[PDB]
Design a protein around this nucleic acid. Structure first.
Lengths: 59, 64
RNA sequence: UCCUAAGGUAGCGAAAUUCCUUGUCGGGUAAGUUCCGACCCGCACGAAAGGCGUAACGAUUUGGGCACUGUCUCAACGAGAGACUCGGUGAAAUCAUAGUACCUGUGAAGAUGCAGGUUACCCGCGACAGGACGGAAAGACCCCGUGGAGCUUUACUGUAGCCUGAUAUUGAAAUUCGGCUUUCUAACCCGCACCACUUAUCGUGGUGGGAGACAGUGUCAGGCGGGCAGUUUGA
RNA sequence: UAGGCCCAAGCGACUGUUUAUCAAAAACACAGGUCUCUGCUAAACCGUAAGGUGAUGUAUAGGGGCUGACGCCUGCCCGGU
RNA sequence: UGAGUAGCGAAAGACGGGUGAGAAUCCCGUCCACCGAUUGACUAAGGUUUCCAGAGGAAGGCUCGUCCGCUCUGGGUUAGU
RNA sequence: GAGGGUAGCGGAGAAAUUCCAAUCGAACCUGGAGAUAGCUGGUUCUCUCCGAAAUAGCUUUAGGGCUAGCCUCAAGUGAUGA
RNA sequence: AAGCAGUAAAUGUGGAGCCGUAGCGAAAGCGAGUCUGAAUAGGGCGUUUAGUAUUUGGUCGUAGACCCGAAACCAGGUGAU
RNA sequence: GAGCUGUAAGUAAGCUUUGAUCCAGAGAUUUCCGAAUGGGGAAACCCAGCAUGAGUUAUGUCAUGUUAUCGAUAUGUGAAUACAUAGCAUAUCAGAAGGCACACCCGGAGAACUGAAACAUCUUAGUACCCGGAGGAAGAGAAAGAAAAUUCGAUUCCCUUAGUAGCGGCGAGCGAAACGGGAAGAGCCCAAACCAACGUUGGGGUUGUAGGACACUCUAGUUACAAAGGACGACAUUAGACGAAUCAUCUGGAAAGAUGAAUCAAAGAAGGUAAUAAUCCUGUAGUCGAAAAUGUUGUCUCUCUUGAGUGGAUCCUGAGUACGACGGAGCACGUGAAAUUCCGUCGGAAUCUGGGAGGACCAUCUCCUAAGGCUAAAUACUCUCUAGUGACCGAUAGUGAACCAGUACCGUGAGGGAAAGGUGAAAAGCACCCCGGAAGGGGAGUGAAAUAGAACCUGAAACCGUGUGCU
């Protein structure tokens, strides 16, 4: 249930590699920040990534 | 299914007209100060795979 | 006289600790490798993985006595259940086929079965346990396998976490050789108080306080890491 | 139907607990002592998120290590970890 | 095969009268023996017709059985407290 | 006694590797799965001809393997064999 | 060969593709000769220059690969009567 | 078109030529549980509200409707807080849920035993298992392509290229594409410039030989994409009906066999009938047939509809996008000289004299035009229905199951799992007599046969008995 309310960014999955080329599973999370943005009704707090906060986005 | 060639062996031999295989020599990579002039000059020449070795590795190179 | 950070203090000591050892001397016994009391050449006691004592307690471990007795000298008799005979009912482990003697030899080096000799008329019932390397469990000891599992560490390689710095969220002013350093409030935070949804203070909203561009969270980097994991440790 | 008793020694203070099915003990626990961490959304623990135990407690309280009634005591050493 | 061999699961029965094809073992009677802080009387859990009557003897009952918690047919459980 | 809670990369343990449905140095069931086994055991009709080895070298190798030596069948040279 | 036509046939049709007719060299390349080399000087590999398609038998490789037999590992579930 | 009341026989009582039973299409009824939905619960049970009605002097009891949650829409709708906004009340909704074929397809997440004769990179393998979303198929799809010819022109599948090029503790091992030969084969809709109306909805507009806007003379229904509601004849499927041709003797219990005379064939496939049937029966070849329901197609009606070249002053052609650094993944390709393309973080373009690609990279040439969307066919599979086939099995075989089988049974549970076919052509299944309490037997009958008597076709070996020649 953690996703960007605008862009739709979410977590990924991949490998963590050691110097000997051993591998284990890990995750790449998203820079989600809890902000209040104007919607049709009361402004409710939603998860919005920082990438969507550039070039001018409502707050 | 189909047989598979030995990739490491196909990089080291070539097929002649009579059907034999031409090879290259060992003991020529480094440490040349420990070998005489006669040894190093005669290791430049090529050789052929022996029949003792042919009886063991003939199936590994069948498409070549 | 040599070395080191120090060279074991008080207490105890053939001790649940002493190999030599049944150490030496006393007690106990007619006779004591056990026991009790002393001595100290303590192989290799020792002060909180504590030292030395200590009433009461113990289905604890030791040594010696009174009383008692079939434990014994050394065994005997009696009662009952099984066992034995008869009527009824009726399994099991095991099993290559079997008309299955002894002595001295021989043999894969311990023979009912091979050699030579000696014994032995055929078939049952009650007892004994020398042999059939007797029966039940593909030896748990030992060695082997580039077999396995659990555990340890200053074996190799990782890893969950936990510290640290840069960067995004993150803004307004002003001193000093764009940066250290100071105030402020609007971001962000409060398992702080009051009000409403609402008979609920989980949640949300509002209003006061506290803190504040820090903290918390995302990405990248360095360090610690038998807490946990996969493996190796020759002939 | 209903305690045998005595004189000495070792270990553990005591009542308790333990290898269901070969070990009940000198082993574990215990009352007491000591060291160390923790200022409260406490430290520590489960998930390792929300939410919980600690605790509807607040240093005369809570977690971890060692020793183990009582009496007399507990000596020297900070190169090494 | 072992072999008509081991066993037949703690204990006191004896006689008379019946039934019956068949009686140590079923029914009736008398005497004797055992428990009685229980082998007596209720009842929760659990089982699920094992309860009653009239019939039966193939199999089950560690023997026998004319008998049964076994076989056949028909019955039996009633709440305002 | 009754009603409940903690589940195996786990739980519980006055602590014994003790218990978790007669099983525990890591429960049971079904799948990957006909895991792997240089190790034991086994492998079914009949005649005719020929007929070994238990050695060397190298090997994480020593009861395993590879090349050479020794056996058999077909073709060629042919006197080169004793 | 795929495809198409044909009775799930036989075989028509289909000439992408494959093997052989020429080798040598790491390659550029040359060619009955090429490589090395200052130099056929010597030496290496070739100039045999008859193959090709289907199929019986032997052996090999990839699939569990002659059959039966582990101690174990991983994944998802069922269990505190 | 004459019997029928399912295994199944039994007796009892009945229906049917005024057309039973039976077969096909269309209807009506359809207890309770179960997503289970009024509330509760240990499934197949218990307890309610509200409005109508049945019954009662009245209460108590009964019948028929309706009352879950979430979502989308009309409506009334104070809060804290003037206005508003959360909340609240009612109405409408073939809106959703669950199951499913342990097959095929797309995505999320993702092992180990094993091989390398040990093992860590690598391999097993993007496999097993788990979760989500579908469809009858899905996925892909209309060049910022492949390449280097005197060029082709969306996608998918088969053959070959080829075990080649390459990747790799360069070890074990992994492994392509373009060209060519085939199956099948249609392409299109939006955003922007710009014009008219009250930011909105209309029109105009879809591209690389450069297209479009503006300004210049101007008119093929494609309901599978391309825009979406309906009346309109032929077939197919679901019950069925016609359908040729043989007699005699012998053996036998029975003739279809043997022996003689015949016949049919667009029919000599098959099964049964007392043994081995083209001519006995059901059938076969070939024709005929539909009340009613469904499917597939075609003929008008019906419904939309704007077409090409010249001018390019000027304007438009998809932005936190492309791309870069750091960390990963995927491309046959393990970071390597790694292009081509995806994710997280941080930076961050250009505007037709523009941008991308041709395996690091630059210059010249050639090809194309990213950052919006849609699309049949050739392709994969079988829980099924209909009609058939086999040098496949024949009861220790074939499915675990030929028979009342996922059953007896076993376990708290998940779960594991068997054994069992055969009288005779026809029950004609032994009336009657004798021994006995009965079971069992000896006769007499049935039958071709009873050593075919239901424990029933044939009836081997182990093992157990009786009587006898030689010892």
């Amino acid at each position: 249930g953690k996703q960007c309310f605008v862009t739709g960014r979410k977590a990924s999955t991949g490998n963590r590699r050691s110097h000997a080329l051993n591998s284990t599973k890990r995750r790449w999370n998203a820079n989600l920040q809890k902000v209040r943005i104007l919607v049709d009704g009361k402004p409710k707090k939603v998860w919005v990534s920082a990438r969507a906060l550039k070039s001018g986005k409502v707050t | 299914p189909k047989m598979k060639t030995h990739r490491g062996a196909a990089k080291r031999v070539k097929r002649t007209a009579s059907g034999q295989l031409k090879r290259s020599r060992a003991f020529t990579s480094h440490l040349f100060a420990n070998k005489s002039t006669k040894q190093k000059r005669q290791l430049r020449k090529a050789r052929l795979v022996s029949k003792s070795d042919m009886k063991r590795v003939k199936q590994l190179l069948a498409y070549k």
